[PDB]
Enzyme design. Structure first.
Site, PDB file in Angstrom:
ATOM      1  N   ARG A   1      11.072  -7.733  -4.832  1.00 21.61           N
ATOM      2  CA  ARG A   1      10.010  -6.798  -5.229  1.00 21.61           C
ATOM      3  C   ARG A   1       9.840  -6.851  -6.728  1.00 21.61           C
ATOM      4  O   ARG A   1      10.782  -6.716  -7.480  1.00 21.61           O
ATOM      5  CB  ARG A   1      10.331  -5.347  -4.794  1.00 21.61           C
ATOM      6  CG  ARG A   1       9.219  -4.384  -5.077  1.00 21.61           C
ATOM      7  CD  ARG A   1       9.484  -3.569  -6.313  1.00 21.61           C
ATOM      8  NE  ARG A   1      10.550  -2.604  -6.081  1.00 21.61           N
ATOM      9  CZ  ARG A   1      11.308  -2.062  -7.027  1.00 21.61           C
ATOM     10  NH1 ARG A   1      11.126  -2.380  -8.310  1.00 21.61           N
ATOM     11  NH2 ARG A   1      12.242  -1.199  -6.691  1.00 21.61           N
TER      12      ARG A   1
ATOM     13  N   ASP B   1       7.966  -2.774   0.346  1.00 27.30           N
ATOM     14  CA  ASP B   1       7.838  -1.390  -0.089  1.00 27.30           C
ATOM     15  C   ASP B   1       8.478  -0.500   0.976  1.00 27.30           C
ATOM     16  O   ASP B   1       8.031  -0.488   2.118  1.00 27.30           O
ATOM     17  CB  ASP B   1       6.345  -1.037  -0.261  1.00 27.30           C
ATOM     18  CG  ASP B   1       6.104   0.336  -0.870  1.00 27.30           C
ATOM     19  OD1 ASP B   1       6.809   0.656  -1.859  1.00 27.30           O
ATOM     20  OD2 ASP B   1       5.215   1.065  -0.332  1.00 27.30           O
TER      21      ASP B   1
ATOM     22  N   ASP C   1       9.127   3.378   1.533  1.00 26.30           N
ATOM     23  CA  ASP C   1       8.737   4.697   1.058  1.00 26.30           C
ATOM     24  C   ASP C   1       9.365   5.748   1.966  1.00 26.30           C
ATOM     25  O   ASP C   1       9.289   5.643   3.210  1.00 26.30           O
ATOM     26  CB  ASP C   1       7.213   4.859   1.047  1.00 26.30           C
ATOM     27  CG  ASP C   1       6.529   4.041  -0.043  1.00 26.30           C
ATOM     28  OD1 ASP C   1       7.229   3.464  -0.903  1.00 26.30           O
ATOM     29  OD2 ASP C   1       5.270   4.015   0.000  1.00 26.30           O
TER      30      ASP C   1
ATOM     31  N   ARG D   1       3.040  -6.621  -2.806  1.00 29.38           N
ATOM     32  CA  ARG D   1       4.466  -6.631  -2.994  1.00 29.38           C
ATOM     33  C   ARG D   1       5.145  -7.246  -1.797  1.00 29.38           C
ATOM     34  O   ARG D   1       4.610  -7.213  -0.688  1.00 29.38           O
ATOM     35  CB  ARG D   1       4.970  -5.211  -3.187  1.00 29.38           C
ATOM     36  CG  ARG D   1       5.015  -4.335  -1.935  1.00 29.38           C
ATOM     37  CD  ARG D   1       3.635  -3.905  -1.340  1.00 29.38           C
ATOM     38  NE  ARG D   1       2.781  -3.297  -2.367  1.00 29.38           N
ATOM     39  CZ  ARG D   1       2.876  -2.037  -2.786  1.00 29.38           C
ATOM     40  NH1 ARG D   1       3.675  -1.142  -2.192  1.00 29.38           N
ATOM     41  NH2 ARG D   1       2.166  -1.636  -3.826  1.00 29.38           N
TER      42      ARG D   1
END
Ligand SMILES: Nc1ncnc2c1ncn2[C@@H]1O[C@H](COP(=O)(O)CP(=O)(O)OP(=O)(O)O)[C@@H](O)[C@H]1O
Ligand SMILES: Nc1nc2ncc(C(=O)O)nc2c(=O)[nH]1
Ligand SMILES: [Cl-]
Ligand SMILES: [Cl-]
Ligand SMILES: [Cl-]
Ligand SMILES: [Mg+2]
Ligand SMILES: [Mg+2]
EC number: 2.7.6.3
Length: 158
Positions: free
Chosen positions: A82, A95, A97, A92
Site C-alpha cells: 500500500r 485498503d 477500513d 491502492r
C-alpha cells in the site's frame, strides 16, 4: 467484540490481494475470523482514472483495543505494498477500513467508528449485509432499513 472490516483493492491483482489480506487478518493476535462475504467488482467512487475495485467484508472477533487492531490492519496494508498517493479516493493495492467495532462509537484523530462514509457506500453496506443481515448501528438504525431507504444498486460479483 466483533469488528467489521471492509476490504478494497484495485491494484496488483485484486483477487490475490484480497486472498492475502484474508489470510493475514486471520493471523492477527487475539482475534479470529467469524464470517467472510463474497467478492464484488465495483466502479471507483472518486477519480475515474483507476481500475475497478474488488470489495468484500469480514467479521473479526477480537480482544484487541481498536487502535491496536488498526495498527495490525495498517501493517497488512503496508506488507501488501500500500502506498498513499496524493489524491483522495485514488487507487491502492489494499485498503482495510474498520466499519464497526462492536457497537462502539469512537471519535479520535486516528480513528472514527462507525466509518465516516459507510452509510453512503453500497460497496461497503452490501458485503456487510451479506455477513450480518441483523446488524443495528450504534445510532439505532438497522442496516437492512438503511439499504432499503437509500436503494443503492446491487453489486456484481468479481
Ligand atoms: N474506521 C477507520 N478505519 C481505518 N482507518 C481509519 C478509520 N478512521 C480513521 N482512519 C484513519 O484514516 C487514515 C487514512 O487511511 P486511508 O486508508 O488512507 C483512507 P481511505 O480508506 O483511502 O479512504 P476512506 O476512509 O474514505 O475509505 C488512517 O491513517 C487512519 O488513521
Ligand atoms: N469502488 C470503490 N471505490 C473506492 N474508492 C475509494 C476508496 C477509499 O478511498 O478507501 N475505497 C473504495 C472502495 O473500496 N471501492
Ligand atoms: Cl471525478
Ligand atoms: Cl462521522
Ligand atoms: Cl451509527
Ligand atoms: Mg477506504
Ligand atoms: Mg482506508
Amino acid at each position: 467484540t466483533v469488528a467489521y472490516i471492509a476490504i478494497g483493492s484495485n491494484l496488483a491483482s485484486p483477487l490475490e490481494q484480497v486472498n492475502a489480506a484474508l489470510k493475514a487478518l486471520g493471523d492477527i493476535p487475539e482475534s479470529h475470523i467469524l464470517t467472510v462475504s463474497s467478492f464484488y467488482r465495483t466502479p471507483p467512487l472518486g477519480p475515474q482514472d483507476q481500475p475497478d475495485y474488488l470489495n468484500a467484508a469480514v467479521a473479526l472477533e477480537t480482544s484487541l483495543a481498536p487502535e491496536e487492531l488498526l495498527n495490525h490492519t495498517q501493517r497488512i496494508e503496508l506488507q501488501q505494498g500500500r502506498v498513499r498517493k496524493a489524491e483522495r479516493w485514488g487507487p491502492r493495492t489494499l485498503d482495510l477500513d474498520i466499519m464497526l467495532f462492536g457497537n462502539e462509537v469512537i471519535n479520535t484523530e486516528r480513528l472514527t467508528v462507525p466509518h465516516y462514509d459507510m452509510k453512503n457506500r453500497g460497496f461497503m453496506l452490501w458485503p456487510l449485509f451479506e455477513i450480518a443481515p441483523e446488524l443495528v448501528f450504534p445510532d439505532g438504525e438497522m442496516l437492512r432499513q438503511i439499504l432499503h431507504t437509500r436503494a443503492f444498486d446491487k453489486l456484481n460479483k468479481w
